[PDB]
Each structure stands twice: as structure tokens, then as C-alpha cells.
Amino acid sequence: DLHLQTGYKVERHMCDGDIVIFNRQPTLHKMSMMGHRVRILPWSTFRL
DNA sequence: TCTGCTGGCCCTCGCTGTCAAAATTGCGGCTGGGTGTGAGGACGAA
Known part of the structure; x- marks a missing residue:
């Protein structure tokens, strides 16, 4: 069921x-x- | 035919009673969601 035909939407990370x-x-x-x-x-903060 | 005092009507004023608003966002913690009662059920003793 993981075949990707054209027109689909994939929610990537x-x-x-x-x-x-x-x-x-x-x-x-x-x-x-x-x-x-x-x-x-890495680590757990926003770095700006 | 004029002078001019007066109640009424309108307008205006100053004052007072009520109205609604009062930074943004985030996290953690506690406390409280009504209560008493006329009668439905069961029971211990006789």
C-alpha cells in the first residue's frame, strides 16, 4: 500500500x-x- | 390706533447617572462541579 502514484500527498518530516x-x-x-x-x-533548542 | 405686562413656548445651560474598557504569550499547581428528603427496599426480633 506504499506505492506512490502521481497526484498523492506525502507528509515528510x-x-x-x-x-x-x-x-x-x-x-x-x-x-x-x-x-x-x-x-x-542536535540538542533541544532553537539556535538563531 | 399705540404702550407694555404677562403665561406660555421654545430654546439653552449646568449637573448628574450610567457604560465599557483596562499588553502579549507560555507553564505548573490546587480546588470544586448541590443537597435534603418522601418514600422504595431490606432487616432483627418477636
């Missing part, structure tokens, strides 16, 4: 090079939330 967006309350201005690129690093 978030690999490196993906685009995400970071936020910190309070968002006072439009610099306070904006996009980044995903780089996969």
Missing part, C-alpha cells in the same frame, strides 16, 4: 532547507515575526 517563521510576544512591529530557513542541529 521537516528536513533542512525548509522555511519557517519565528515569533516572540509581544509582537510590537513587523520585524518581530518573519521567516527563516531550517538548519537541523
Whole structure:
């Protein structure tokens, strides 16, 4: 049942090079939330 | 035919009673979800 014909959708894991967006309350201005690129690093924190 | 005092009507004012709002996000922990009762069931003793 794992055959992939054209037109399907596959929910892959978030690999490196993906685009995400970071936020910190309070968002006072439009610099306070904006996009980044995903780089996969060890340990358990966001590293910006 | 004029002068001019007056109740009424309108408008205005100042004051007071009520109205709604009061940064963003996240995590952890405790406490409380009504209660008493007229009668349905069972029982110990005789």
C-alpha cells in the first residue's frame, strides 16, 4: 500500500532547507515575526 | 390706533447617572462541579 502514484500527498518530516517563521510576544512591529530557513542541529533548542 | 405686562413656548445651560474598557504569550499547581428528603427496599426480633 506504499506505492506512490502521481497526484498523492506525502507528509515528510521537516528536513533542512525548509522555511519557517519565528515569533516572540509581544509582537510590537513587523520585524518581530518573519521567516527563516531550517538548519537541523542536535540538542533541544532553537539556535538563531 | 399705540404702550407694555404677562403665561406660555421654545430654546439653552449646568449637573448628574450610567457604560465599557483596562499588553502579549507560555507553564505548573490546587480546588470544586448541590443537597435534603418522601418514600422504595431490606432487616432483627418477636
